[PDB]
């Protein structure tokens, strides 16, 4: 395929700050003829439509703000934003229109920082109500924390255990900035029943050592 | 000015058929090639089909024999007609218009139309009410199992209690849909107050609550 990669995926930012998104081609866009690049940047923001930004690399779409400046030839391009508004906050794709099939980098998006923050971590054994029904999940919730990147592992009996976890990641919190995740091990009651200690263990680089939670059947 | 408007999306089961419509207005769309893009739930946008001013087609691999693109000049239409629907066919489809006269450069795209493609059956959620175990602050929860399609709605209190709330994206397993929300309050709080998870499902037609129970040995 004529394929785009797009470094990073995410990008922690400051308001006001200049940014620089990056898009690599696995074969050149630049077209001989007419020395132009066959390369655009699109803007999608939450529950909307790509809207085209950039194209031919560095030409700005009418009514797309100054700040936004593409470049780059070749293999190699780059979207820079002077000045980073809130409403930047969002994904950006690039594509390629050199060749059919026309493709599409997988975006990178831009997110606030804020400041390291701690995970609360909480463990729900199974509901009484779940377990008539001969079913058993575990809830771990790990709220609040800050930077993104976190790591669950559930371990039983002081064993770990992988198939029939279900994680869920929350998106950047709009008022604290922070991120939340919910993980669930769904287990049959039968297998529940045969162990004593579930712990959700979270790692995070707020701490040198996991933070775990646990109950005993 | 230039308006572009999706339709005819919606749930079917694997192999099934659809057509898409894409209404255009505010300018010449003779002028124009069209295209569709669709969106996964991977958020990855994948280009589907483009139709030139002239009727020339062109096909994505995947749907190349499965989906037909086409146009009506003289009502302003595009549509995309997909037969034997694969689960990977799971995405929003925007219809695009051409930026110029002369290529098919996503210059102008619709909101989208959603297309699920599943075989899983209308399943309400078991709705399992999430109570602390063994302070100042105390986190309760409301796990959502198992439904089918999205979306479900959840409320703690009916509205009341908003913040110290996070409900989490739901996630697929096994073609059904898990949702789980935690609401976080004073330890004065609750269970002094009682707290009570709501959860509507308006394709199952259920809507049920949850008390949140505090644990504790009224045990036998």
Same mark, same amino acid.
């Given at each position: 395929?004529?394929?785009?990669?797009?470094?990073?995926?995410?990008?922690?930012?400051?308001?006001?700050?200049?940014?620089?998104?990056?898009?690599?081609?696995?074969?050149?866009?630049?077209?001989?003829?007419?020395?132009?690049?066959?390369?655009?940047? @699109?803007?999608?923001?939450? *529950?909307?439509?790509? +809207? %085209?930004? =950039?194209?031919? &690399?560095?030409?700005?779409?009418?009514?797309?703000?100054?700040?936004?400046?593409?470049?780059?030839?070749?293999?190699?391009?780059?979207?820079?934003?002077?000045?980073?508004?809130?409403?930047?906050?969002?994904?950006?794709?690039?594509?390629?229109?050199?060749? @059919?099939?026309?493709?599409? *980098?997988?975006?990178? +998006? %831009?997110? =606030?920082?804020? &400041?390291?923050?701690?995970?609360?971590?909480?463990?729900?054994?199974?509901?009484?109500?779940?377990?008539?029904?001969?079913?058993?999940?575990?809830?771990?919730?790990?709220?609040?924390?800050?930077?993104?990147?976190?790591?669950?592992?559930?371990?039983?009996?002081?064993?770990?255990?992988?198939?029939?976890?279900?994680?869920?990641?929350?998106?950047?919190?709009?008022?604290?900035?922070?991120?939340?995740?919910?993980?669930?091990?769904?287990?049959?009651?039968?297998?529940?029943?045969?162990?004593?200690?579930?712990?959700?263990?979270?790692?995070?680089?707020?701490?040198?050592?996991?933070?775990?939670?646990?109950?005993?059947? | 000015?230039?308006?572009?408007?999706?339709?005819?999306?919606?749930?079917?089961?694997?192999?099934?058929?659809?057509?898409?419509?894409?209404?255009?207005?505010?300018?010449?769309?003779?002028?124009?090639?069209?295209?569709?893009?669709?969106?996964?739930?991977?958020?990855?946008?994948?280009?589907?089909?483009?139709?030139?001013?002239?009727?020339?087609?062109?096909?994505?691999?995947?749907?190349?024999?499965?989906?037909?693109?086409?146009?009506?000049?003289?009502?302003?239409?595009?549509?995309?007609?997909?037969?034997?629907?694969?689960?990977?066919?799971?995405?929003?489809?925007?219809?695009?218009?051409?930026?110029?006269?002369?290529?098919?450069?996503?210059?102008?795209?619709?909101?989208?139309?959603?297309?699920?493609?599943?075989?899983?059956?209308?399943?309400?959620?078991?709705?399992?009410?999430?109570?602390?175990?063994?302070?100042?602050?105390?986190?309760?929860?409301?796990?959502?199992?198992?439904?089918?399609?999205?979306?479900?709605?959840?409320?703690?209190?009916?509205?009341?209690?908003?913040?110290?709330?996070?409900?989490?994206?739901?996630?697929?397993?096994?073609?059904?849909?898990?949702?789980?929300?935690?609401?976080?309050?004073?330890?004065?709080?609750?269970?002094?107050?009682?707290?009570?998870?709501?959860?509507?499902?308006?394709?199952?037609?259920?809507?049920?609550?949850?008390?949140?129970?505090?644990?504790?040995?009224?045990?036998?």
């Amino acid at each position: 395929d004529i394929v785009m990669s797009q470094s990073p995926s995410s990008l922690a930012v400051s308001v006001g700050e200049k940014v620089t998104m990056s898009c690599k081609s696995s074969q050149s866009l630049l077209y001989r003829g007419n020395q132009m690049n066959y390369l655009a940047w @699109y803007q999608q923001k939450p *529950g909307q439509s790509p +809207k %085209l930004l =950039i194209y031919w &690399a560095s030409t700005r779409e009418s009514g797309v703000p100054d700040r936004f400046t593409g470049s780059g030839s070749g293999t190699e391009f780059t979207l820079t934003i002077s000045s980073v508004k809130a409403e930047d906050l969002t994904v950006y794709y690039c594509q390629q229109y050199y060749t @059919y099939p026309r493709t599409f *980098g997988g975006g990178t +998006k %831009l997110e =606030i920082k804020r &400041a390291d923050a701690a995970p609360t971590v909480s463990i729900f054994p199974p509901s009484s109500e779940q377990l008539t029904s001969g079913g058993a999940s575990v809830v771990c919730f790990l709220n609040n924390f800050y930077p993104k990147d976190i790591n669950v592992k559930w371990k039983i009996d002081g064993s770990e255990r992988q198939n029939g976890v279900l994680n869920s990641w929350t998106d950047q919190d709009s008022k604290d900035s922070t991120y939340s995740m919910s993980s669930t091990l769904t287990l049959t009651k039968d297998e529940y029943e045969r162990h004593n200690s579930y712990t959700c263990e979270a790692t995070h680089k707020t701490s040198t050592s996991p933070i775990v939670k646990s109950f005993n059947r | 000015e230039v308006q572009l408007q999706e339709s005819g999306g919606g749930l079917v089961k694997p192999g099934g058929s659809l057509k898409l419509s894409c209404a255009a207005s505010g300018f010449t769309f003779s002028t124009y090639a069209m295209s569709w893009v669709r969106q996964t739930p991977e958020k990855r946008l994948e280009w589907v089909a483009s139709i030139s001013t002239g009727d020339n087609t062109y096909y994505t691999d995947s749907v190349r024999g499965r989906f037909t693109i086409s146009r009506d000049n003289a009502r302003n239409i595009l549509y995309l007609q997909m037969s034997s629907l694969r689960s990977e066919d799971t995405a929003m489809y925007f219809c695009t218009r051409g930026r110029g006269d002369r290529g098919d450069l996503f210059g102008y795209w619709g909101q989208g139309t959603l297309v699920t493609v599943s075989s899983a059956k209308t399943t309400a959620p078991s709705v399992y009410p999430l109570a602390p175990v063994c302070g100042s602050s105390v986190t309760l929860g409301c796990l959502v199992k198992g439904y089918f399609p999205e979306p479900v709605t959840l409320t703690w209190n009916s509205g009341s209690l908003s913040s110290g709330v996070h409900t989490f994206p739901a996630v697929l397993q096994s073609d059904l849909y898990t949702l789980s929300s935690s609401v976080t309050v004073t330890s004065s709080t609750w269970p002094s107050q009682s707290i009570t998870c709501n959860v509507a499902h308006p394709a199952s037609s259920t809507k049920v609550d949850k008390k949140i129970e505090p644990r504790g040995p009224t045990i036998k």
